[PDB]
């Protein structure tokens, strides 16, 4: 289980946190040294809680699917919370066992449903250390009217950063303030399944992609990735997802 205090948070501390986050996630191997998560695992091990104390010292545990890095929900006191999707409910069976109540959320854990419930897309969502703090505050108070965005700001500032070290750095730099994610950041979040899958394919294909993953580079423009030679891929793709877990 991962843990991080917002109090005294820095880019270094966040990097450490995300590092700890990926460290919590088990892995069967590494393609290109990129840790390939453990696809096969007991449902109990398939999830790991992030303990996260916001600036206000309000801690809450976030239930992460370790095999896909996917957030399933979170806890706040005896009140636990989980997305309406059957993945979170399964998660609820293993995590927050002590939680006296598992709350099924009124929205699915996917960006689409989250953005709908939040009433605001991730492009307009704040990101950075204050965002995780804000997330914690909102989530602990579970303002369902807006908790959706808070979940998103938190998920990206954890799960997505855990996956992409590019996302990690961008968020982690925003110690003292926040910013709406770049199209590059968001592109990574989406491409994670495609890009990494093609890395696996490419691993047995001398590094050639079959399906060229269109990724948004930092300039907010699409760039064709046909080769694992792309440094923005190899240096930023911290965690590799399993073909069995992807599609």
UniProtKB/TrEMBL annotation:
One MF term in the entry's GO annotations: rRNA N-glycosylase activity
**InterPro entries documented for this protein:** Ribosome-inact_prot_sf, Ribosome_inactivat_1/2, Ribosome_inactivat_prot, Ribosome_inactivat_prot_CS, Ribosome_inactivat_prot_sub1, Ribosome_inactivat_prot_sub2
Instruction: Name the UniProt key words of this record, in alphabetical order.
Output: Hydrolase, Plant defense, Protein synthesis inhibitor, Toxin
Keyword Hydrolase (UniProt): yes
Reaction(s) catalysed by this chain, per the record, are: Endohydrolysis of the N-glycosidic bond at one specific adenosine on the 28S rRNA
| EC code | 3.2.2.22
Record's keyword annotation contains Hydrolase: yes
In its UniProt record, which GO terms are filed under biological process?
defense response; negative regulation of translation
* Name of the top EC class for this enzyme: hydrolase
Which family does the UniProt entry place this protein in? Belongs to the ribosome-inactivating protein family. Type 1 RIP subfamily.
Spell out the protein name for this chain.
rRNA N-glycosylase
| Native source species | Trichosanthes sp. Bac Kan 8-98
**Higher taxonomy:** Eukaryota, Viridiplantae, Streptophyta, Embryophyta, Tracheophyta
């Amino acid at each position: 289980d991962v843990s991080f205090r917002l109090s005294g948070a820095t880019s270094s501390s966040y990097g450490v946190f995300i590092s700890n986050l990926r460290k919590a996630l088990p892995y069967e191997r590494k393609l290109y040294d990129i840790p390939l998560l453990r696809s096969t695992l007991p449902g109990s091990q398939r999830y790991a809680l992030i303990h996260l104390t916001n600036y206000a010292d309000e801690t809450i545990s976030v239930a992460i699917d370790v095999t896909n890095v996917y957030v399933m929900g979170y806890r706040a006191g005896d009140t636990s919370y989980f997305f309406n999707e059957a993945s979170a409910t399964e998660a609820a069976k293993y995590v927050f066992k002590d939680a006296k109540r598992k709350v099924t959320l009124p929205y699915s854990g996917n960006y689409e449903r989250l953005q709908i419930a939040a009433g605001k897309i991730r492009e307009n969502i704040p990101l950075g250390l204050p965002a995780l703090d804000s997330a914690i505050t909102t989530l602990f108070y579970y303002n369902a009217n807006s908790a959706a965005s808070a979940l998103m700001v938190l998920i990206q500032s954890t799960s997505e950063a855990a996956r992409y070290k590019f996302i990690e750095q961008q968020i982690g730099k925003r110690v003292d303030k926040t910013f709406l994610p770049s199209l590059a950041i968001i592109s990574l979040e989406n491409s994670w399944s495609a890009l990494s899958k093609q890395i696996q394919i490419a691993s047995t294909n001398n590094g050639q992609f079959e399906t060229p993953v269109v990724l948004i580079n930092a300039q907010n423009q699409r760039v064709t990735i046909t080769n694992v030679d792309a440094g923005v891929v190899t240096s930023n793709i911290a965690l590799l997802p399993n073909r069995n877990n992807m599609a």
